[PDB]
């Protein structure tokens, strides 16, 4: 749940 910040940053990263 804490990685929720990076999770959504996946589509933006790749």
XYZ file of C-alpha atoms in Angstrom:
14
model
C 0.000 0.000 0.000
C 3.007 2.257 0.571
C 4.259 1.599 -2.960
C 0.989 3.037 -4.270
C 3.082 6.091 -5.142
C 5.458 4.127 -7.370
C 2.776 1.789 -8.717
C 1.023 4.570 -10.631
C 4.497 5.748 -11.634
C 4.835 2.608 -13.755
C 2.872 3.746 -16.807
C 4.780 7.030 -16.624
C 8.164 5.359 -16.152
C 7.988 2.914 -19.062
